[PDB]
């Protein structure tokens, strides 16, 4: 959630969107964890998705 909040302001604040490492300095933790945390956090895709 903390990341979404930053990504919201920083979306228009930066005019593009914060770089994958941008919110990392803003956030307390080791800041490389953005990749790991962002991955497992994703919701699985419906296997019934028509393609």
């Amino acid at each position: 959630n903390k990341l979404n909040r930053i990504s919201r302001q920083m979306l228009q604040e930066m005019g593009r969107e914060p770089t994958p490492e941008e919110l990392a300095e803003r956030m307390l933790m080791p800041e490389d964890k953005i990749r790991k945390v962002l991955k497992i956090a994703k919701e699985p895709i419906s296997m019934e998705t028509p393609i």
Binding site: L11, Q12, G15
Partner: protein
């Protein structure tokens, strides 16, 4: 004009008579014009971002008197340019910067602002940009948005006769279709009761809407019905009579007044009696008290004394009711005028079925119709009804809707309110009733006046509009609670919401699709395309003339649902389709052009494209074939208002390229224009030997070629670039200049073909503005060559041509002329797994030195190394730990002492069977991971290559500028040898005597220094773009894209076709020894089967052959006189003879051409063959063709003697031989071909699935099961649906038996059915397998 420079190189001999009054406009017009209107600064509501802005603005908060208005917008420079945007994969787009003004009104105003902060250009989204060629780049891929054809907004009156109720009687219904907002439908019924339904919802009695508009019953009868006046004067019932009321009725009693009996009882009132009453002016007659027994009273009637209602409005009076209202003192009684023929008593009967009474009642019953089940409320019903058709937000017809609405209602105003008014609804109802009464007609959906054409520009505006409404709710929500001066117009307006509306359209939408680029015609015929149910809409309509092509449409599930745009068609100002025409005043055909829309053209009488006029342009014949109203017949000499512009304008760019089209049946013609788009370009761009004259226009208008910006002389010619030194008359004063064209070189197309430009001009040659500088793929010297013409013979050859099959000589494949170059993009991704990251390292377990040879130290194949199937393009290895091997594998490693790695081999290797040369390598890296060796080398190379290109710019540019300074300095102060001695850099000091030339030196100075710095900034930006880490997907560490160029020639299985719709599949490639040859000994390239010609009626393919043969003759002849080196005189003489050809053609010709350098060059280009132009319907004729064959030295029959190369003996009968243009479509056999033994399998249900691009097995269908069931073959069927596919056990038990040499099957149960059992059992159903 009167012939260009690349026209002096080669000229196409043009048959055909009709002079062209108008020349083909820009073929890409629609696409470019539309988008040009969308993004532009328009100071008004004309369609554009400005208009879409002005609709939703200004946005005010909820009652808070906090308003946010809109100032102006701008488009920032694109982040990446077109070329760079494709490589990286992002979209080609510009930032949208819009100035907003936030005003806050003092609470409890007089309206005034506490503070107003103007937020400078807040950024919302990046909107895509259209290429100069009219394409979009969504993700790294050129995509086209097809124009759409839909029903124009407005009102439409239909029938629905027949099928309903099968009683006949027809029906008449009206439909109001707004551009935005709910639909309003009116319809009759078998009882002549008018009904209304909003959208498709429940049917409701029509009148219920009028009540919601606050109209009482009295005013409804007063609106839709006339008044029959009844007077009680003296005593017992007089009546007012309008003498016309008696038409269509029989006297019900004695009609007498003024002491004279006009009509008796039982005598129908005809035109004679009516005349008597009309001319004798009989106002009042005596009627019986019983005639009002049926007459419905108009208004309300009350008893003056008792104040009680005697009879309500819309009630049928009776003899007893008349008594009760007479003694109350009523002199007059108004009743309805009702006639079952002329003016129908419909509304009257509609009111008796109306459950409501007052406005609130109707509003209750209306609100409960749209949103039923929930309790109605007064404020809710009022809000809903006003929000449907009366709200500026939820409803708009815009301009086209309002115009056709008013136009179809016979109004004056062509523009009006964008919502519906009570006047509007009433009028529509009136028109529907008038049609049911017999006066007026119903429209038809298929008419092109009711069909409106959208396009990229209009569509994008809608999506941007949708983005602004979903952002509107937010802005109001925040401005609700807003603190005064802290927030500004940034914290409110977001980016993601608006950007995603537009992004979701271009990214995935049925109208946004990959450009079909295997072929220039394919591009240009894709960019002009339309899109729209039963056979009525698919079928061709009379209004399609000159607008939609009748013969170019796909043949398949959607026929006539696509079409294509005609040649001269243009989008009307309002968005209809209009076509060019010639105004015929008095008896002269005037060349003033006039554009008429679908409805505009209707009433005029238009002449025919093919007609005979002369001199002053008076019609030669006393009557000429013409079409007037929806039909065509012979029309008198001077009647015609207009005439067709050209003979072509009926067809499309596709159909207009088929020679002798008038001679081919439409089915094969369709297929031809359908197949011509599939012609893959060739290795040697050839030229059509037989042609139309559009090929030049198609080549140029499509961006595939490179056209001169300004005229001049070629300074430098390289296979890379072309630099033109501009003529001074065309040159601007400052910067001097030269035009530098950077040519596109070998690169991948969307269809994996090769798109490569070649310079068509030579060093130091005069070129004029609008001349072809370089040909593109499949274009030759400015014309459009989609293939290569070749010598063809019609005769059955030992069945090898059997159906459509084509038998091709070896000479063709040896000449490498039909060879084709394919560029395939292969990728290698180094991802991240929980076990570890994947490495691109060159260390691969279990590979020899020969395998790793072709790889560099880094693991990537060298550029230029030729590879075949199986070679390793990119070494890649992924971690898989603790293999957990088995006893015998462990002994194996023990004996042979191999250390089994902790990494598994993922390396990218060349797909099976495809073999080519590596033309390129790209390395994308995550930002922050160290670029490997090769990747760094690439970056260094790109840096150096970039510097060379930019420096080349500056070098040629600076010289171009200083070369002008040299010339201006010599005027007023000429020193010739003196000036070029001193260093060029020191020239800028010298001034001049007072003149503009001093100011000219000033101009060139300013621009010089600008270039110096502009070069600098451009270099810096390029360098940063190279070194910047490309953004990748989540999880991907690095990506390697390899580009292979395979050169495929031709082999049995390829599809081939002529322009006439004759398909074919090359059967055998025959030696030159066995080819039929003529007495002269020249073999023939292709042997077609004649049997295909009569059945499919395409006779042009024969004509195309004949004229072709003749054409080659004129070529061959020149080849002899040029090999004789006779002289310029003899050559000149013979060519002139050819270009005249006996009489009356439009070609004109030479002796204006320079007799030496220009003429000799032309002949050299003609020696291959003499290009001929057959206009579409103006094309040549047999006689013209036969005469050219006389000049050819070749027989009139077009047939000669041929000898079999095998026996050498003659062939009985002459056979037709000639030159037919033939295309290679891309179905090429080494794509379609697939075979699989044992591949991968799907996880969910175990079934064959290709995962390696080793394709999944063939799909065995139900119909095929029946086929096996008809044969007695049980075991083939079991093995088909059990062991060969679905049995996860049976498959392995089978495979082992196949190698053992035991053919058996131990079938077991297919896993599919085994799943159905559990799926059933997952429910409450117990399903068991019984017995034994």
């Amino acid at each position: 004009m009167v012939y260009s420079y690349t026209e002096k190189k080669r000229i196409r001999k043009d048959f055909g008579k009709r002079p062209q009054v108008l020349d083909v406009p820009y073929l890409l017009s629609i696409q470019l014009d539309s988008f040009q209107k969308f993004i532009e600064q328009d100071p008004e509501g004309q369609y554009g971002l400005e208009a879409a802005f002005r609709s939703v603005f200004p946005i005010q908060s909820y009652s808070g008197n906090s308003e946010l208005q809109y100032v102006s917008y701008r488009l920032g420079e694109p982040v990446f340019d077109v070329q760079e945007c494709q490589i990286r994969g992002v979209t080609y787009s510009a930032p949208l910067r819009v100035k907003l003004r936030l005003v806050i009104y003092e609470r409890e105003a007089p309206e005034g602002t506490v503070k107003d902060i103007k937020e400078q250009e807040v950024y919302m989204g990046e909107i895509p940009l259209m290429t100069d060629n009219g394409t979009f780049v969504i993700n790294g891929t050129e995509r086209v948005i097809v124009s759409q054809l839909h029903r124009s907004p407005g009102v439409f009156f239909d029938s629905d006769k027949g099928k309903t109720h099968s009683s006949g009687k027809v029906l008449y219904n009206a439909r109001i279709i707004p551009y935005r907002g709910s639909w309003l439908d009116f319809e009759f019924d078998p009882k002549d009761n008018l009904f209304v339904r909003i959208d498709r919802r429940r049917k409701l009695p029509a009148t219920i809407i009028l009540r919601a508009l606050n109209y009482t019953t009295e005013q409804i009868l007063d609106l839709f019905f006339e008044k029959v006046i009844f007077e009680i004067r003296d005593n017992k019932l007089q009546m007012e009579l309008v003498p016309e009321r008696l038409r269509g009725e029989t006297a019900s009693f004695d009609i007498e007044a003024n002491g004279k009996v006009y009509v008796e009882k039982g005598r129908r009132i005809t035109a004679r009696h009516i005349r008597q009453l009309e001319k004798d002016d009989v106002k009042l007659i005596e009627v019986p008290v019983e005639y009002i027994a049926g007459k419905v009273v108009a208004k309300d009637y009350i008893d003056e004394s008792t104040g009680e209602l005697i009879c309500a409005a819309n009630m049928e009076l009776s003899l007893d009711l008349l008594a009760k209202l007479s003694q109350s003192g009523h002199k007059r009684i108004e009743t309805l005028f009702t006639n079952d023929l002329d003016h129908g008593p419909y509304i009257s009967e509609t009111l008796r079925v109306d459950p409501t009474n007052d406005r609130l009642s109707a509003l209750v019953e209306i609100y409960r119709m749209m949103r039923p089940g929930e309790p109605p409320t007064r404020e809710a019903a009022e809000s809903l009804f006003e929000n449907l058709f009366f709200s500026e937000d939820r409803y708009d017809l815009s301009a086209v809707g309002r115009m056709k609405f008013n136009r179809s209602l016979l109004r004056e105003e062509i523009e009006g309110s964008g919502i519906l008014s009570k006047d509007d609804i009433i009028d529509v109802m009136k028109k529907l009733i008038d049609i049911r009464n017999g006066k007026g007609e119903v429209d038809d959906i298929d008419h092109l006046g009711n069909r409106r054409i959208r396009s990229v520009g209009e569509m994008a505006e809608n999506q941007f509009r949708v983005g602004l409404v979903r952002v509107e709710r937010a802005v109001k929500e925040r401005l609700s609670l807003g603190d005064l001066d802290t927030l500004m117009p940034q914290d409110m307006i977001n980016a993601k919401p608006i950007s995603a509306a537009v992004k979701e359209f271009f990214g995935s939408s049925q109208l946004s699709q990959f450009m079909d680029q295997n072929n220039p015609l394919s591009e240009i015929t894709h960019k002009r395309r339309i899109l729209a149910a039963g056979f009525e809409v698919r079928d061709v309509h009379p209004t399609h003339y000159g607008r939609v092509c009748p013969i170019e449409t796909p043949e398949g599930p959607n026929i006539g649902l696509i079409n294509s745009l005609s040649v001269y068609a243009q989008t009307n100002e309002y968005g209809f389709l209009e076509t060019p025409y010639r105004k015929v005043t008095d008896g002269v055909v005037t060349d003033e052009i006039h554009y008429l829309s679908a409805i505009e053209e209707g009433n005029y009488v238009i002449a025919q494209a093919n007609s005979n006029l002369d001199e002053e342009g008076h019609f030669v014949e006393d009557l000429v074939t013409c079409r007037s109203k929806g039909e065509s017949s012979l029309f008198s000499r001077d009647q015609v208002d207009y005439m067709d512009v050209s003979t072509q304008q009926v067809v499309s760019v596709g159909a207009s390229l088929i020679p002798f089209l008038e001679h081919d049946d439409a089915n094969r013609a369709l297929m031809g224009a359908n197949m011509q788009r599939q012609a893959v370009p060739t290795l040697r761009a050839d030229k059509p030997l037989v042609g139309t004259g559009m090929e030049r226009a198609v080549a140029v208008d499509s961006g595939v070629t490179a056209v001169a910006k300004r005229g001049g002389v070629v300074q430098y010619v390289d296979a890379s670039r072309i630099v033109i030194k501009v003529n001074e008359d065309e040159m601007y004063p400052g910067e001097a200049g030269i035009d530098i064209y950077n040519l596109t070189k070998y690169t991948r197309s969307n269809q994996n073909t090769c798109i490569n430009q070649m310079p068509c001009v030579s060093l130091g040659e005069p070129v004029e503005r609008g001349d072809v500088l370089a040909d593109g793929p499949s274009t030759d010297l400015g014309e459009l060559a989609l293939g290569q013409n070749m010598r063809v013979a019609f005769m059955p050859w030992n069945g090898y041509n059997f159906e459509d099959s084509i038998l091709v000589s070896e000479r063709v494949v040896q000449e490498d002329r039909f060879t084709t170059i394919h560029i395939q993009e292969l990728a290698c991704v180094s991802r991240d797994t929980k076990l570890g990251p994947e490495e691109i390292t060159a260390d691969i377990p279990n590979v020899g030195e020969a395998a790793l040879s072709k790889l560099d130290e880094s693991g990537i194949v060298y550029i230029g190394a030729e590879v075949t199937g199986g070679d390793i393009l990119v070494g890649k290895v992924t971690p898989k730990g603790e293999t957990q091997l088995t006893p015998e594998e462990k002994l194996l490693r023990a004996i042979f002492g191999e250390k089994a790695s902790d990494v598994k081999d993922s390396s990218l290797r060349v797909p099976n069977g495809v073999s080519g040369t590596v033309i390129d390598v790209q390395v994308f890296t995550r930002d922050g991971v160290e670029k490997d060796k090769r990747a760094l080398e690439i970056e260094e190379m790109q840096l150096k290559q970039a510097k060379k290109d930019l420096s080349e710019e500056l070098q040629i540019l600076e010289a171009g500028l200083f070369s002008r300074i040299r010339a201006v300095l010599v005027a007023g102060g000429v020193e010739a040898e003196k000036l070029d001695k001193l260093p060029r850099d020191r020239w800028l000091e010298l001034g001049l005597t007072d003149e503009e030339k001093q100011n000219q030196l000033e101009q060139l100075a300013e621009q010089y220094d600008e270039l110096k710095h502009e070069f600098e900034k451009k270099l810096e930006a390029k360098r940063r773009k190279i070194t910047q880490g490309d953004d990748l997907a989540p999880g991907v560490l690095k990506i390697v894209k390899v580009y292979l160029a395979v050169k495929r020639r031709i082999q049995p299985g390829d599809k081939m076709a002529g322009r006439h719709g004759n398909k074919g599949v090359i059967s055998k490639i025959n030696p030159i020894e066995d080819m039929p040859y003529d007495e002269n000994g020249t073999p023939v390239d292709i042997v077609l089967n004649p049997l295909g010609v009569p059945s499919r009626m395409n006779i042009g393919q024969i004509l195309e052959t004949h004229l072709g043969m003749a054409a080659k003759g004129i070529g061959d002849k020149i080849n002899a006189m040029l090999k004789q080196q006779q002289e310029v005189a003899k050559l000149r003489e013979f060519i002139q003879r050819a270009y005249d050809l006996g009489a009356d053609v439009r070609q004109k010709v030479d002796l204006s051409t320079f007799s030496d350098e220009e003429v000799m060059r032309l002949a050299e280009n003609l020696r291959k063959g003499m290009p001929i132009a057959t206009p579409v319907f103006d094309g040549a004729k047999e006689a013209e063709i036969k005469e050219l064959l006389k000049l050819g030295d070749l027989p009139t029959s077009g047939q000669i003697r041929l000898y079999d190369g095998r026996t050498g003996e003659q062939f009985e009968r002459p056979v037709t031989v000639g030159y037919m243009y033939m295309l290679k479509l891309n179905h090429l056999v080494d794509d379609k071909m697939h075979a699989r033994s044992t591949g991968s399998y799907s996880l969910v249900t175990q079934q064959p699935l290709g995962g390696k691009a080793q394709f999944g097995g063939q799909r065995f269908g139900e119909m095929e099961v029946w086929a096996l069931e008809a044969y007695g073959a049980a075991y083939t069927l079991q093995e088909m649906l059990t062991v060969k596919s679905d049995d996860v056990n049976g498959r392995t038990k089978m495979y082992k038996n196949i190698v053992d040499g035991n053919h058996q099957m131990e079938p077991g149960m297919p896993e599919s059915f085994n799943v159905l059992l559990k799926e059933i059992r997952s429910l409450g159903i117990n399903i068991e397998l019984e017995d034994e």
